[PDB]
Design a binder for this molecule. Structure first.
Ligand SMILES: *[C@@H]1O[C@H](CO)[C@@H](O)[C@H](O)[C@H]1NC(C)=O
Length: 110
């Protein structure tokens, strides 16, 4: 699924949904029609990421993004070689974002 491109489906009940973009290694949004899609369709970026993220995300930059609904999440600091805490803005981030220190450790080593 994570490998599949997004699918809006034939319906017209447009909604914003998340799909994992393996090129950007980021979950992004798309307008889903309400019926007939594929598995690369998530309601939250959390789900999308915990489902589709890979270890290549450990090499990605720590992105706060442009939004201000700040939440403190974990991310891997490649320079220090450790999982650090940062405030994610709520939108347009990438895969190097974990929802627990443990998860960050599990993905990027310890
Ligand atoms: C997936 O991400 C890449 C890199 O950001 C981008 O070029 C491409 O347009 C994205 N795919 C879609 C369907 O937006």
């Amino acid at each position: 699924s994570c490998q599949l491109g997004y699918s809006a489906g034939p319906c017209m009940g447009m909604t914003s949904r998340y799909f994992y973009n393996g090129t950007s290694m980021a979950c992004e949004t798309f307008q889903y029609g309400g019926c007939m899609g594929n598995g690369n369709n998530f309601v939250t970026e959390k789900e999308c990421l915990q489902t589709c993220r890979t270890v290549a995300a450990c090499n990605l930059p720590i992105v706060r993004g442009p939004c201000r609904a700040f939440i403190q999440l974990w991310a891997f600091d490649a320079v220090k070689g450790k999982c650090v805490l940062f405030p994610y803005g709520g939108c347009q981030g990438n895969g190097n974002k974990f929802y627990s220190e443990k998860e960050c450790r599990e993905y990027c080593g310890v």
